[PDB]
Every structure is written in C-alpha cells, then in structure tokens.
Amino acid sequence: SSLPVPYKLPVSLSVGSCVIIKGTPIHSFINDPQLQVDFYTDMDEDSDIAFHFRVHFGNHVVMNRREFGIWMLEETTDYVPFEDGKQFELCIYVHYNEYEIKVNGIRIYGFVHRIPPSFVKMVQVSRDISLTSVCVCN
C-alpha cells in the first residue's frame, strides 16, 4: 500500500470538490472484501458522518449518515462495477444537493446532502484495499 489503511485525511470540501481514491482490493471477490469511505465532520472516529459508503465487492453498496451519533435510514444499490483483482478509481463529486459517486468513470449513485458538505473535515478510507493515491481536486 502506498498509503496506510485506515487512511484519515483532513479535508476541506465545497461544492465543486472531488475526492479521487485509487486502490486495489486485497482479497479476491469470493472472499467478500469490502471498501469503506466515511466523510467525517471531525478527526474523531465518533463524530457525525455526512456520508458513509461501504462497498461489498461483487455484491452491493450500503450508504448512510450518522447524525447526533445515530445512524439514519440506510440506502443501497446493487450497481458495483468494480472488477475482481484490478485497480479501481472511485470519484466522489460534491454537487450542491448531493455527492455523486463514480466507479471507474461510471456514475452509480447520488447521495443527497442532509448536512452541508462544507461540514466535512476528514475523509477516512478503510477496509480491504491497498491504497495507491487519494486526491482532493477543485
């Protein structure tokens, strides 16, 4: 891994920002690896989460948010166009009303803001990936 995992990256996000995550799953899909990305409101792991994104490779993606310490209503999609054993590029684009999630250039979901994305102060990338690079662009 080029970067340690869990990878906790302090960030400042605004409308127009893009978080770009490149990495590779560390297990084959028959071993049910996962990838997780959390848009935290503070460096503290127990702080509120504006956008939680957990991929079960080869299966589905679960998304949620944590508000006042409470997990809210989970959202899911079965559209997970990651390839077994290959490097992926995950782009999370901050729009005025949602996070647009793209996997290998393919839009898979739009997760609507319930708090402003400018409240996000740390992005944590975790679980079963080797992390090649993480960029925040505008």
Numbering used by the authors: 2 to 139
Could you give the paper's own sentences about this structure?
Galectin-13 (Gal-13, a.k.a. placental protein 13 or PP13) was first isolated from human placenta, and its gene has been mapped to chromosome 19q13.1, which is in close proximity to the galectin-4, -7, -10 and 1412 genes. As with all other galectins, Gal-13 adopts the typical “jelly-roll” fold formed by sandwiching two anti-parallel β-sheets that consist of six (S1-S6) and five (F1-F5) β-strands and a short α-helix connecting strands S2 and F5. Gal-13 crystallizes as a dimer with its subunit interface formed by the last five C-terminal residues (Val135, Cys136, Val137, Cys138, and Asn139) that are located within the F1 β-strand. We found that Gal-13 forms a homodimer structure that is stabilized primarily by the presence of two disulfide bonds, unlike the structures of other prototype galectins.
To test this hypothesis, we mutated Arg53 in Gal-13 to a histidine to assess whether we could restore lactose binding. Using the same conditions, however, we were unable to crystallize the R53H variant and had to use a different solution containing PEG 3350. However, we did not find lactose bound in the Gal-13 R53H mutant, even when the crystallization buffer contains 50 mM lactose. Nevertheless, the R53H variant does trap a molecule of glycerol at that site, and that trapped glycerol molecule is not observed when we flash cool a crystal of the R53H mutant in the absence of the glycerol cryoprotectant. Moreover, the C2, C3, O2, and O3 atoms of these two glycerol conformations occupy the same positions, whereas the C1 and O1 atoms are oriented differently. In one instance, the C1-O1 bond is oriented towards the conserved tryptophan (Trp72), and in the other, this bond is oriented towards Arg55. In this regard, the conformations of the two glycerol molecules in the R53H variant are different from those in Gal-3 and Gal-8.
